[model samples]
Target: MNIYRYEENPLITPLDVKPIHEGFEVIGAFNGGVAEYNGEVLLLLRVAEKPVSEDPEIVLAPVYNAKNKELELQSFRLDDENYDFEDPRMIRSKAKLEGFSYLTSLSYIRIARSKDGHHFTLDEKPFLYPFNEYQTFGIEDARVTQIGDTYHVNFSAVSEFGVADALVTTKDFENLEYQGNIFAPENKDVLIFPEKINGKYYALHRPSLKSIGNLDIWIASSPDLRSFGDHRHLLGIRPGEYDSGRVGGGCVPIKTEEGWLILYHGATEENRYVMGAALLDLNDPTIVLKRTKTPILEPVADYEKNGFFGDVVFACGAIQEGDTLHMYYGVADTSMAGCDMKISEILHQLEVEA
Candidate 1:
């Protein structure tokens, strides 16, 4: 492995996040989308917060009240009904039904500013919140891409209805213009390419199938940014390998001499997440040239293995300065961390082993 981690790992922890809501504690602040703006590195952090309940039997769920169009806390007694509160992430109405009629932990995007890419100043309040009916549950796991002077944000929007991809564009980062949902329910992990390819906008996304299929990365093209079509399957799980379970799009693709480089995350049967590289044709991003047979980076350290969720190192964004690629990743669904990799080395690996 040619990856190098920052000395001060866990660069941003839950403790570092300044909680905006009074009743919620900072349980998670990870999976940030990275970008550079005004001579500084900016991370649009996915801050996950859950309401605290004094009684362990009754779970306090923050749900979107369609009447008022705001998040309101509701009490569900664990011993009373058929609702299953077994998982920490979601509350299923039926004891056996996993993700239906459930309330998920509320998450929103926050801003973290860093001048040196290592030390950061986390914002006091959220940069983006759940205001619309579509994102009543919350918004999360955002990725930012700078196209010309505009910075476009694409994130997973969650509600009782389902999870989908939402788009927002801003020039100054203060005034965000919501652009509606790009992909419908059961689809997410989307990243728009930095620029148009052959007069068409290309993006990498994952759509989960209910049955007779596998959860894998897919590609789509758009004549305009609003609508994406011409869908095609890009990559799927490698059986008996690290990515035998599922894979998702990571940072926006990086352009190099060989091709458009992408570093994505894959999981095993046990949900152990790791990072791998993929190469695509520069002119046509839909064509996959090469993919890593195995993960280049895996969870080894305590920080990577122990957290809200264990054995996950999901990278959402990366910054390129000369030959070094600075990757901002989430550790165990808890905190933010960074690792550096050389462009030449990664290109070489894809050429030799891919």
Candidate 2:
């Protein structure tokens, strides 16, 4: 498959956006949710911000105090033996029950508008942020699914307890209706189907099972948008393949004649992330028709190969226009980039899968 990356790649960098909290700087602006609202395109960007620290020995972590209803920064000395700074993304506490102490940065969803679907202007105010107890770590990676006039936004809500999937609904984009947590702790990467199948709503989600199970994708349905049930396993990791580590739902399921077309992200044990394609039965979306053995998109670009997290091409959303697929993905967990591909060619690649 051929990918036409925009000449103006890395369309939205951290510097392009502003931070909400004082004394903090925007570290990343990527992994946006895609949607076409009114006459323009909408991207609910996951903007990560961290405190500005001058001392290399000291690291600051952001936490939301629900009782106080305020955002607070906690400091830790690198020389402290109880804390582990091995992961650049998070600071692990040896004694803590929650596992990690705090994140290197706190992420929240912000809105970016585009008239041509390439050049974008970010909103000064945040669309969603860490308000409740569950999102103290931050809310990350939004996936928007339009059902009728209303659009349902599902994203990962992170806190001290664990990572889980949360939901909110919006019509005009100016106001929002918070739907609270849909999936329990230790689950995320949710993608709700655009329309209902067999008079029920369907969604693809990833549940993190450390001991007895590995990270894999699953499917579930709901009569109402809230309270999803009838859980079923949909996709799993492939050893010695591109998805050796884990697999999760990426873009919202796109409707096609062949089946429900979906683009998903998979990672290796080394943590190199790639994008792949899959098709599901139209009537019964739980039945996956075919899946590509190899990745369709990889972290080949310089931006994708290096950043906060290297060798990553994580996507939360995409827009399909005629034969062209306008894809906006996160590069190295640092910045947002755009690429275009012929939808027919992507489908053909799936057909070639034996």
Candidate 3:
């Protein structure tokens, strides 16, 4: 009724790529942004690296210094009272300064090319890295939108304050233009539309307000891609449903005969993430046309059920060929895989009662 997975479930494993840093392991190479340039399918993968230390006493995290244009690792001794290392993914500074604690990790974007859309050749050079104060923590989870001749890269840029969506532009992927952080702190998982609708560009973003309440999807607009504003609350968690906890934009919204087909990820309170789809009004994307009552794809297979994070099938980008949607997704935040389903199948499944 939904999607069929590739026989080789985990399509791109960490073992497929070399670690970005020496003496580190490529823990993750998933959650990539997809695009087609000159007949080549490119994946801008979010590569997570961790220090290859046998000793469990210390945690090592890598960060790129924008000021010095240098890359360095910050080590935190586990025994030290000033640091906390309960999580394998991050090391937190126990010392509070001005009512805040510090955390660190290493994530960057690398490129992979696939002529056949299945077998990929991972490039040794990185497509993106932390090179500014805003992205000191790392760049993650890319969503690419092709507007006109240029492609807009929207990713979560993390730092000491919080996570935000930053914009960068590329035509051929060889050269890029950094457009700076478009969204402020406490926002991420953003996807821009391909072109302006009714004289304005639209984007879907998630804003998690811990101080007030729950996580929800929101919409924003921009005359130019760099300056995003006019935010409006869009889709949100459906109580007692599969998406009861949180929801965020997955891939760049695909334009269809029905509407702007937004493929997104939804998580239950239990933390199991699945992929869902929704339809938006063609002219006014703010109006929701139809949203799936159930997930188009869920984490049922062994590969999707186990890894860096369990029970997750987060997809960042997808390509549509005729009626078939060729999807590239991350399995349990560990490896990459594909899911192929008909566009008509999902559109037929979504409830439009409202």
Candidate 4:
């Protein structure tokens, strides 16, 4: 299948958004959750911002104070020796820690509207922000699954507590009902199916493992949107392959006559993210039917190869139109771009591989 990117690439960049907090700068605005509403395409963009610091001897990390219920900045001395800043993305503790001490930039979800899929207008205020203790660090990477009139939003909420997937629902986008975290700590990349199968709701999620286990995709079922259980392993990393490093759920699962078309992201040993496809059994999504031997999309464009995080094309959402699949992805974790692929061609290619 031939995949072509939108001519107007990098549709939304960090420059398009202004920093909400004072003394902060918008670093990246990408990895948007998508939906088609009221004849317009809506993007729930993950806007990442970092504190602007002139001090050469100090680095600041954004944190949400649980007790006070406020977003605050924590600073670390350059020569503290207790912290390591070698990784630009995170501030790590010298002492053995379960996870990074803090994120260099904080991320929150924002809304952007577009008459056509290409040109987008961002909202002045954040669509979703850190509120409770769970989201003390911030929330990032949302996937919107519309079931009937309501849109179910599942995103990664990071904090000292642990990185977990949280759910929220909206009917009109103006008012939202928070559903709290569906999966426990150490799980993310939550993709909910648009429709129920066998009278039950289904979702795909990724659980991060350290020693014995690796980061891979899994499936679960829920009677209601809030509580999810009956977990089973669905996909795993292939050794020395494109998905050797890790694998996670990408866009919302699309329903088709063949099966459930799932577009997921897989990382290489070098940590380069690429897009791959998998077909899951419609009745029993736990059973994987077919998978792409290679990536359908990778970091080929210049923008995809360079930015905050290079060599990455992570997609959080996609919209299907007739035979065309319009996918919006984060380029190098910096900017957003669009690509189109024929659904029939993709299925045909899968069959050819089989």
Candidate 5:
């Protein structure tokens, strides 16, 4: 099958739904995961909050204080005697806190419900908060799956130790059961398969290694939901392609007569992230049937091309209703948006090139 690319369909723009607590000049409410609970569509939004400081040279940082149950603020000067704050991912500074960075982002999942899956009503209060020490920087993208009566949510918990996949379960949207960190440091984008495979649980995870291995997708098996092992690399970055940089699992894998349809995100070396799909064997997830050589959805619109970061579309969650797949993705690392596509069309685009 030949690969096809879709245009940007922005559902929500940057800071579209601002929480009451959010002050003026806060961005990054993107990378949301969706799940259908009861009769409504629930969206777990990754709300990235930052302050609008007056001085560009000084970067304001926030750290949660467990002892006082409050956030601590610090500042990093760009012109410090011995430090570099130019790199977004890394900073070398003596002023750096023992376990924190200059720019700290706290992630809280906000609830947004839609009746027809287009327009949504956002809740005022956050659904989830960063409590553990590892999540002092806050929770990042979340992937939600409904197992039986409970909705299992796995999200990236960021802090001094890097990013870790954390688990939480909630039956009623009001109260969430926190299950701590499931995967240790340098691991994220973990999505549990909708159903058990061969009498055991299966999940897809992306473990980050600086220069050792490509940021590829891997499969893991577990007898219980808490413990997972026997991880095997399932897919790698497609060289000289849209996913040449890295790839991670996106929404919950949709089960079909052909196999498990996975809608995932991949990026190039330039850091332009886009959405793609892969089909896995129904009984054995390790068996990859087909994959999209190109992105099913790419950043083209102005909203997707520019923001907190540029030319990036990252999705940690999505929901399927009938034939349509509703996706909530982060645009340019600055804001969030919503879009939908036909499930059958996406599956049909996957190529099984020998």
Candidate 6:
């Protein structure tokens, strides 16, 4: 199997857009939701903001306060030299709650509009913010899909309770309707198909299982839009590749003439992430046609190799215009980036071996 990686990838970065909110620095901005509305390409950027602390040993973090519906900042200090800060995901210390503990960073969805889909002008304010008890930790990665006249958004709701999938809908960017959390904790990377299949709406979800099932993609169907059923396992981990650790649905499945083309992200045990593709039966999504034996995009660029989390190329959204499939991805968990490929070229590269 051969994988194609771009030489000049990580096209966009944190320096591309200006920050709207003052007194806060944008640490990481990526994994945004993509939408095309009223002759403009809209990107709902996930902007992460944190305060500047002078203390070298204390790390200031942000969390949303549900009781007051406000943003709070917290400080974690290294008192005993035995603390472990090397692991990016987990930090352990004896004095866990000594300093100022509040929301170190708050994630707000910002908007950027583009006429040509390559260059964009960002808005001055955020499109969404922390509202209610459930989303106190802030809203994370969002997957957007246009079904009929309305656009449905399924995003990650982070809070002290757990990580879950939340639903919302909007016709115009100015007004949004919150549908609340649909999936329970330990669940994310939910992508809703653009259209109905066999008169039913379908979505792909990944529920994190530490001890039981490995993190893999699963499919479910809903009739009205709220309730989902007919659960089926769609794909599993690809050993000895970028997806050896786990894989999840990325963009909303693109319905092509060939089949249901889905561009997804996968990670290895080394924590390096990449993007790949799979084709499914249009009428019955459970039937798989062909899957990439290798990655379509990998962490090769400087920006993708060095950042908040290094060696990562994660994408959650993409748009298909004519022969081009433009993908918006996050580089090294730090900034936003983009890449594109032709539809005919991708389909021509599809291979199936018995």
Residue pairs with backbone atoms closer than 3 Å in model 5 (clashes): 33-317
Off by over 4 Å in 4: none
lDDT of each: 0.87, 0.90, 0.85, 0.90, 0.77, 0.77
Native-referenced Cα lDDT, model 1:
0.87
Please give the range of 10 consecutive residues that has the lowest summed lDDT in model 2: 93-102
Better of 1 and 3 by TM-score: 1
Estimate the TM-score of every prediction: 0.95, 0.97, 0.92, 0.97, 0.89, 0.90
User: In angstroms, how far off is 21's CA in candidate 4?
Assistant: 0.7
Candidate 6 has its poorest 10 consecutive residues by lDDT at: 94-103
After superposing candidate 3, which stretches have Cα over 4 Å from the reference?
77-87, 92-104, 352-354
Clashing pairs in 2: none
lDDT tens digits by residue: candidate 6, 1-354: 233334444445567655544656776778878998999888788877756677787776666788876656766775637554554433445355221123456677777787877777788787777777767777888889998889988888877777788888999877889887877777899999998889999999998875689889999899967888888999999778678999999888988887898889999987889888888988999888988877778888788789878998888888888977777888887787777776666666566421
Model 5 lDDT per residue over 1-354, tens place: 222222434555544766434332446677878888778777787777765468787766666665577777667777877666555533456565222344545567777777766666777788777787777777778888888888888888887778899999888776777887888878998999987789999999999886579899999998877789999999899889999988999888889888999888998887889988999999999999999876888887788898767888787676666877677777787766677677778777875432
Across 232-310, the per-residue lDDT of candidate 1 in tens digits comes to 9998988888889999999998989888898989999788999888999999988899988767789887889999888
Residue 38 lDDT in model 6? 94
Q: Which structure is stronger by lDDT: 2 or 6?
A: 2
Q: Worst lDDT window (10 residues) for model 1? A: 95-104
State the TM-score for model 3.
0.92
